[PDB]
């Protein structure tokens, strides 16, 4: 089942509860939270108290993407604030295996994020720790950027790795993609092998979230 | 005039526009923004896009307190997002004078923040750059903490320094205090020499912001 | 009462329990622990597990001097390992007041350390948090260095500040000095106003700790 | 020959010379030193002066594992303090080749350490600099943790790489493993291709080091 | 077409314009600038104002190698100072793809640098961003060091990767090598697959730059 | 005796030896070197190899101002490269007293630099270590900026402190000022208590260095 994860980075921060409720009413499967500390990326967004404040409105799981360094303290705070999934960048933790283990020990699904330049081999020794891999199709920091075409090849490479792992372990690790996903390209991203699609500006930047998500669903029906 | 500056760190982040509108309806003079980057303090709060989103609701000035390091990039982005006042901690900038000058060059009032341990003498060479001094009466990072009594002596010391500076320059630098300010202690903070009072939990943690701010106003009349 | 605090930085690390027992038998009032993380100073010494291992041998209080940055995690670990006093350098903590409060909340006496260049004014806003002030008479990092003569004036300045504070609060904050203290200069350090004296090479570098400490006591009787 | 390298991280720091002498009497081939600076890992252990103090007791080589960042200053000081082998984490040095060269230029055998997540390919361009590769089977920082099963696959991968390198160069690079090694799993670690085994809690946490090391030797005979 | 890129790190800094003019008169194809910030490498060299001052003398392109961290501010200032090519180390930028894009958006050719230990796979996801790959044959920081023999294998590996990419895209990415290149080894570097050769001490440390460059050209004609 | 110290930050880096020779011919007493590592200040200038290259041209002492962090490695390399005076910022060294001692132990005169915001009290515990105090009259990083008027008060404060120290010790510590010094303001800087004057753009940005320095001398004779 394909999952659509609207990114609140593009929402109206003066009415965040309404924005979350409205995108859930439109069919969102996850609420995607882009957490930036002004150090790992050149922008500062929102911390765990924002996650806690939205927990009563989030009848679907909250997916926290940590663009912060280091990561372990915010892993704990976001878990306590109600996150369901936490992902972080391997470059941002000296002890990646420990950080992934901590996410699961805090009760959350765990994942790693690949920047455009980050090789996929960074995943090969932590597959048993992973519930999801997020591939960035833009350079992290900002919404509204354009999908980097080479990401399709990386998605195919990750999918092949995860297909082989599922054959050995029986576990399916999810593939999420974040960056410039639009109705007009979502089918290509799914065809490359992804199953979870983060979109900010394409949804929140439009007047009718129901129409956008339905149009994305119709394109995904073509990829299937 | 005394200014009351409710701190949105204690507000409902799911309904921030309503919270800002309601505290302005209750008599807020400024909206206080506690910006934390998880490096200068052990907490992460909210960035310039939150300031920009609240600008249409803020009919009073936005007062941005940067608990971040370094500071110059966020000075620029908060100014562009509609901040009216920007303050930062001297320990967080290698070039304090440059950072204060940048705030004014971006169109904003500029200030420095003193942590509880920070000596007042860090202000003495930048008075011409300052519009406000913020004294922390708690260790920055968290709301709901208790006012540190020694802060009253520091407020008196800063007020004496700024009184002397006004005698020389004719310009009055404002004094703000942040940390554990409540109705039952606000008069003492004013008597020590402060004029702008940040309060988070005492306002946003209560059901009627109008009642709290009016009660603070009544205590300030005694100061 | 004057306190002598032998510094284990100069002891035989292959027989640390014996060294602690022997210096206590010689009249030590405190065991001084110089903790260095290779970042705040250009040397690496010993961590909290060494403190824990010596706790059964330390029938006198353990005085931990943190030459580390940042400080709060090691404050907690050294307190849990049995430290009685913890001091740190104000330059090494972004939130000095918080760090001093944490030391006391962990059940320990709290202090700040002044490097040779550090002005005394850094103490003026945390006197209610302080149980001790340590003045370095050498640049931290190494034993066996020579006492910097200007330290005497700084000790006098701190003593005057603490005398005035005691007049207002009734609390006496202790003054410790660390760096090149020897039998031949300890009386001058006491005359300047200090009450607690750290010595490493002058004690542990000699064959008879009883003789050294007794000679220090005799010189301190002259300062009194 | 298989080498057993007891880790003093788990020893009695009040009687370190006795501990070293006793584990050597029990058959230790190396004394393993876990050096932590509270920055590369969230723990602080012991510096070069502890190595120097143990040198007169160490009739077998001292194997220093640097969990520190940066590494070059401590490479030099541990070499001067009597280390025989020095290993460090590639992530902790901007110039890995330079750091490995420095270890050998100081008279020591040189190695790299792989954290559980670290890919083996980080070794492929420095084989001529290496005397040993250490694979962590736990996340570095603490003794007493449990062996991560995936480490066996990584050991096999490293052994295959080093077998190919020996075919080309004629030189055998040793493989060390550190983390949760016990009598009941040491044979599996050897079968995967390792030859040097670090153990802390399994040896120093037991009353008779001779019995533990002999029992490990008996299991290695089955490998 | 082979390019020789004399490295001004080895030139007379009191007469830099003459040095640049003289090496161009000798046949230089590029002027190589080794920029060091004392943080990414343990040396400090020269900043963008030096590039700007040499722009009037550089009738051939200026090739800036950034051994600095972070990189984006200096990418911009070197581009504005007249650089034609800018390369940096992937380890020095958190967002490698962004930094490479910025170089091209500033009007320059973009490249990545591989330290001796750095795996070639760090290039595989940014080939569309690259105009050049620089392989260090010494540990960066200093001139006058000796060529690391394993570099030849890495050059071959990069050339195979770039050959496959040229077949897919039609774009040829250049391969530069820097570190201990001399007349007596330049042919072997070319045979391994490189096309651009940085040399400092071999050129500037000799009295006749024309003779050295001619001798290098003659060895390359044999390659 | 007033000293004029032209700052090569404003010189023609393509002809640095000629620039140094020409400013010495014009009456320079020192050659001022503004060393920036892109970390302590947002600019990168020139390292010790540039100092070494100018040593044969510098018949007057070289005065190195380190705007770098940390400082001790560059203290050593600039001393070895021929510096006569080395100054650094107290905020840039964890162990200020050690760093000042190192400068003298390397054979150089030692000093501290005060940024515009830096309090003078940072000097009070190292007077025995100091040969010079430099007060910045601009925020460090760039030439061509405007003199900050409050610097005059700081100069007066430092001169009073140093006067008292000279009475106690018999040692006169020099006072240098750097930032926007021009012929039209140099007398006021001297009257405030300074004796050594760094000027970049006012000298090197003009066609006749002899005329500028002579004009500065004439204003100083009126001071
Ligand atoms: Zn995201
Ligand atoms: Zn605040
Ligand atoms: Zn100490
Ligand atoms: Zn180890
Ligand atoms: Zn280069
Ligand atoms: Zn200067």
UniProtKB/TrEMBL annotation, chains B, D, E, F:
Task: Classify the source by domain of life.
Answer: Bacteria
Q: Which residues cross the membrane?
A: none
GO CC annotation terms, alphabetical:
cytoplasm
Which EC main class describes this enzyme?
isomerase
Quote any Pfam family the record assigns: Ribul_P_3_epim
An example Gene Ontology biological process? pentose catabolic process
User: What are the binding positions for substrate in this chain?
Assistant: 7, 65, 141-144, 178-180, 200-201
Q: Which residues bind a divalent metal cation?
A: 32, 34, 65, 178
Q: Is NAD among this UniProt entry's keywords?
A: no
Binding-site positions, Zn(2+): 32, 34, 65, 178
Q: Can you state which reaction this protein catalyses?
A: D-ribulose 5-phosphate = D-xylulose 5-phosphate
Q: Name one GO molecular function term.
A: metal ion binding
Cofactor: how bound = Binds 1 divalent metal cation per subunit.
Q: Which SUPFAM superfamilies match?
A: Ribulose-phoshate binding barrel (SSF51366)
> Which pathway, per its entry?
Carbohydrate degradation
Check the record and name the PROSITE patterns matching this protein.
RIBUL_P_3_EPIMER_1 (PS01085), RIBUL_P_3_EPIMER_2 (PS01086)
Active site, per annotation: 34 (proton acceptor), 178 (proton donor)
Briefly, what is this protein's role? Catalyzes the reversible epimerization of D-ribulose 5-phosphate to D-xylulose 5-phosphate.
Protein family per UniProt: Belongs to the ribulose-phosphate 3-epimerase family.
- Identify this protein by name: Ribulose-phosphate 3-epimerase
Lineage here is: Bacteria, Pseudomonadati, Pseudomonadota, Betaproteobacteria, Neisseriales
């Amino acid at each position: 089942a394909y999952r659509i994860a609207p990114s609140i980075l593009s929402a109206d921060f003066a009415r965040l509860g309404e924005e979350v409720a409205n995108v859930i009413a439109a069919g969102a499967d996850l609420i995607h939270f882009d957490v930036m500390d002004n150090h790992y990326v050149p922008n500062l967004t929102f911390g765990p108290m924002v996650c806690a404040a939205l927990k009563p409105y989030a009848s679907v799981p909250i997916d926290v993407h940590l663009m912060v360094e280091p990561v372990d303290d915010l892993i704990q705070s976001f878990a306590k604030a109600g996150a369901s999934i936490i992902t972080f960048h391997p470059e941002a933790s000296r002890h990646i295996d420990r950080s992934l283990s901590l996410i699961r020990d805090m009760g959350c699904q765990a994942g790693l994020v690949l920047n455009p330049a980050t090789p996929v081999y960074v995943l090969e020794n932590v597959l048993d720790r992973l519930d999801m891999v997020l591939l960035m199709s833009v350079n992290p920091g900002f919404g509204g950027q354009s999908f980097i075409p080479h990401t399709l090849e990386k998605i195919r490479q990750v999918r092949a790795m995860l297909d082989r792992y599922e054959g050995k372990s029986g576990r399916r690790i999810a593939i999420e993609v974040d960056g410039g996903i639009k109705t007009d390209n979502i089918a290509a991203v799914a065809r490359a092998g992804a199953d979870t699609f983060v979109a900010g500006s394409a949804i929140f930047g439009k007047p009718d979230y129901k129409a956008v998500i339905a149009a994305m669903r119709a394109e995904l029906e073509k990829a299937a």
